[PDB]
Structures are given as C-alpha cells and as structure tokens.
Amino acid sequence: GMSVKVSVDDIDGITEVLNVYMNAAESGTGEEMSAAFHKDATIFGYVGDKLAFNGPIKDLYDWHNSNGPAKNVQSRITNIDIVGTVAHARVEAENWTNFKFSDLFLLLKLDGKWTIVNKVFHLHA
Amino acid sequence: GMSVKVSVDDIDGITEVLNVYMNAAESGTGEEMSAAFHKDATIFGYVGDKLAFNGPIKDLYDWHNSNGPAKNVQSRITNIDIVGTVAHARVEAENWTNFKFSDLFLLLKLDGKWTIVNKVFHLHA
Amino acid sequence: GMSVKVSVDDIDGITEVLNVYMNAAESGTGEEMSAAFHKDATIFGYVGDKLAFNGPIKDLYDWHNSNGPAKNVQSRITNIDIVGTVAHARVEAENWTNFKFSDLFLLLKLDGKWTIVNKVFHLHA
Amino acid sequence: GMSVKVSVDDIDGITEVLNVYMNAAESGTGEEMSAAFHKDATIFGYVGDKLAFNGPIKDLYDWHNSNGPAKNVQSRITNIDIVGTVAHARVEAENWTNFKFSDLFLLLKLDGKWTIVNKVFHLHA
Ligand SMILES: [Cl-]
Numbered sequence A, B, C, D: 001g002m003s004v005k006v007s008v009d010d011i012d013g014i015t016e017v018l019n020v021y022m023n024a025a026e027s028g029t030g031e032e033m034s035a036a037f038h039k040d041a042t043i044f045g046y047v048g049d050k051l052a053f054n055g056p057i058k059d060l061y062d063w064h065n066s067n068g069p070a071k072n073v074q075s076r077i078t079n080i081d082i083v084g085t086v087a088h089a090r091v092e093a094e095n096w097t098n099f100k101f102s103d104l105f106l107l108l109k110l111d112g113k114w115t116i117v118n119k120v121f122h123l124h125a
Helices: A008-027 A030-036 A058-067 B010-025 B030-036 B058-067 C008-026 C030-037 C057-066 D008-026 D029-035 D058-068
Strands: A037-047 A050-056 A074-083 A086-094 A098-109 A112-121 B037-047 B049-054 B074-083 B086-094 B101-110 B111-125 C037-047 C048-058 C075-083 C086-096 C099-108 C113-123 D037-047 D050-056 D076-085 D084-095 D099-110 D112-124
Touching: A008 A030, A008 A074, A008 A086, A008 A098, A008 A112, A008 D076, A008 D084, A030 A058, A037 B037, A050 A058, A050 B058, A050 C048, A074 B101, A074 D008, A074 D099, A086 B049, A086 B086, A086 D008, A098 B074, A098 B101, A112 B037, A112 B086, A112 B101, A112 B111, A112 C057, B010 B030, B010 B074, B010 B086, B010 B101, B010 B111, B010 C075, B010 C086, B030 B037, B030 B058, B030 B074, B037 B086, B037 C086, B049 B058, B074 C008, B086 C008, B086 D050, B086 D084, C008 C030, C008 C075, C008 C086, C008 C099, C008 C113, C030 C037, C030 C057, C037 C057, C037 C099, C037 D008, C037 D037, C048 C057, C048 D029, C075 D099, C086 D084, C086 D099, C099 D084, C099 D112, C113 D084, C113 D099, D008 D029, D008 D076, D008 D084, D008 D112, D029 D037, D029 D084, D050 D058
Parallel strands: A037 A112, B037 B111, C037 C113, D037 D112
Antiparallel strands: A037 A050, A074 A086, A074 D076, A086 A098, A098 A112, B037 B049, B074 B086, B074 C075, B086 B101, B101 B111, C037 C048, C075 C086, C086 C099, C099 C113, D037 D050, D076 D084, D084 D099, D099 D112
16 A cells, blocks of 8 residues: 655656656757657646647657757746646746646656646746 | 646646546446547556557456546545646545555646546556 | 544634624724734734734734724635644735735634634735 | 745855855854854743753853864755745754754844744754
8 A cells, every 4th residue: 555645756857857858848859759648648837828738748859849949048947746646737937939838747656757747837927 | 829827627627537437436337437538639658668548548447447437545635737728637535446556647727628548657666 | 643634624613713803993992903913923014115914913903093993894714724723824815994904813722722822924916 | 125045045045144154163162153143033942841041142152162062073055945025044064062952943034135034942862
C-alpha cells in the first residue's frame, strides 16, 4: 500500500519534469519539450476568443516550433500538490516571446517516473 | 481579455459543474455524469499496478454504469484555483462504493460556461 | 502521532468553523465571530497605506462591531489544505459592506476541534 | 490601485524571504532566522500531545539555538499563493535533525518587502 505523505523525493521528481518543459520553452524545440509529456497528453487554451488549443498536445509542439524559443522567458513553479500517483502543478511564465502565461498541470507518476498528462493555460491581457 | 480577478460568480459556476459530477457519482448514470465534462475530456488513474484509466473519458462513464451509483459516497470540494478562462479543482470522495478517491481537475470556461476537460485521481490504499 | 491523510471529517470541521466566521460576518456580533478563533489568534492587513491590523485579533471584533453586520455579503471557501493537526484555508468575500476581501487562514486542531489561529487579508482596490 | 495579477516579481520576493528561513534552518542561528519574520510573528505546533509552540515566535528562535542547525535538512517550497499584499506559502522539511515538518505560512508585503507573519507546523509521525 502506497502512502500519500508528501515527500521531498516526489517534489523533486515533479520539479524535474517541469524543468524539462520550462527549459524547452526557453531554449528547446517542440520535440525536446515533448519529453516532459505523456504520449497522450492534452492541452486546452484560448488565444483571444478562439480555442486555439482543443486537445491534441501535438498542437503545442508545432506551435513552439513556429514561434521559436523564448530566450527571455521567466518561468516559476508556484504550486505542487501531490497525492500518491497523481499531482497538480502551476507555472507562471513572463516574456514568453512577450506573452504572460498561467499554466495548470496534472501529472501522473507513470511507472515511478512523473510525467505531465494534462495542461491548460490562460493568456493574460 | 478576461480579468483574472477571482469572482464569486466564477466560483459558483465551477462549484455548479462539480456538483453535477458529485451528484451523478451518488445517484446518477455515466451519461448524467458526462454532463459535467467536455466532449474531449480525459481521465488518468491507477487501480493497483494497472493504469485502468489511460485517456478516454468514456471509460469513466462505462465504469460508473457497471459499478453503479455510490449511495453512501461523501464528496467535498477542497480547492478551486481560478485564473480567467481555466481553473484547477480538487475533490475528496469517501465510501464511493467502499472506495476513497482524491480527484484533481482542470476546467475550461467554454463559451462562458465552466466544464471539466481533464481528470486524474488517486485511489487510497 | 496523527495521520495527515485528508478526511471528509476534518474538511467538515474546518468548513464548520469557517462557517462560524462567515455567518457572524453577515449577521453576528464581534463576540459571536470570535467563537471561530483561538484565544491568541492574530490578524494582519492593510487598509490603504496603513496597516490597520497588526496583530491583535481584538481589533477584528471591535471593527466588526462598529462597522456592523454585512447583510449583503457573499463569502465562499475556495481552498482547504489540511495536514494532520494544522491547516490553511482561503475565503473570498464580496459586498462586505461594499468591500471585497481575500482571506488567508491558518487553523489549529485544538484538542480535536478546529479553530482559526491566524488571519491575513487583502482589501481589493 | 494595486493589481492582484500574480507576478514573477512577488514570487521572487516571497522565495527570497522563505530562503532566509530555510538557510537559517540549515546553517544559521535563531537570530539569523528572525530576519525572515515580522517582529510580532507567531508559531503554533504540537510535539506529541503537548502544544509546545503556543504563540511566541521567540520560542522558535530559542529552540533553534538549543537544537542547533540541521546540516542535513532538505527543504522545499511547494506552494506560493499570492494576492496583493498578503500570501500563503508551504514548505516541506526533511531530516531537520531527523524531524520531518510541514510549514504553512502567512506572509505580508510590509512596505514593499515580503515577510512571514504567521507559522503553523505539523511534525510527521
Ligand atoms: Cl503555451
């Protein structure tokens, strides 16, 4: 039986995968960014009043490749809520190519290794 | 651009959709439960060592139909983190047909109405 | 020692004491409001540039007596983070005599029953 | 008029002060730890059945001088919830002289400088 007692181990595991994403946002490609995600991960988010992202995580990688690396981006984790095999995380990004993002994540501990399965975001006005 | 200031309106909209899910859990069918979810919603979760839920939200509605309503279930919302057009939410369920769940949700304000796009859970040992 | 696994029982206990605060805010006196707080509870908060609340919880009850009940107030619990014998909780208030507050709480399970020990708030501009 | 839009600036100020605490907990004295706390900060917490910490923050600095620095402690921020002038934050400590803590904080932007005004903790069994 597994304990849900929050450990520094799990905090670090989640932080690590989150860093994989934050580091690809700054310096990497959509293929490098996909290393932080489950093969069937999803993403939802509005660009204006258009739902530019409506499920397929492939749209995030393709977008990151067109828009390019955000050399000046500043990303911070602000919440890691862990319970056994799943978790929630929040990341705030600023100057992601002049964009300000609030990212919400759901993560799964897939075979002992944490990975992002879901992502939603809000573009700030 | 939608303001990210947290409003009582938004809190009640999210509570309202989570009530659809929680009430369906106790007294409803999987079809009634699906009223709280996006058409392309997902669900990930472990039962033992098997990843019984690996994306398709259909697996949720099918399992709720087979397992039937949890008449003795007690569920509570413990967190609602809102930011404009998306949100996170946590729900604790007990005696869901003798099960204990921690649910993590990602929500989207689709066309002015809140709906669950993602769900992960932990089954307590 | 006590387990930190989150239970519906504790959730309800905290909700209940937070109810004592939200109901007194709307209808009760400062003396009725203090029933939700430890004897040595505190409160910090700015009104403009002045730190009108800088420790003594006495000041909360006195202000709620002069200002009087907020009949039109809508208050909601949005977060309850529980870890064994202590917890954090957030509450959003609107039209508290025309004010809009965000409340952050620390609570203590004192002798098996939850009570608020710390309070801080932000008056929305 | 202040905005409550969560900024990387405030996330960095809160991380700053919290680091002064974590660092003093590892390598510093009680007076160095005091640098991260308001003059009238509080601390509640149980050691067994006894409420060893029942308000005075003086007690924390006294106990850290007696107990000495936890050279082996691994500490991690897990939550920064910010709203204007106040905030909540959580920190997980392990091997704090063999102790495991969960720290729930309430902070205040006292004259533009974040500082910890409240602390509660749970000592894991
Ligand atoms: Cl994005």
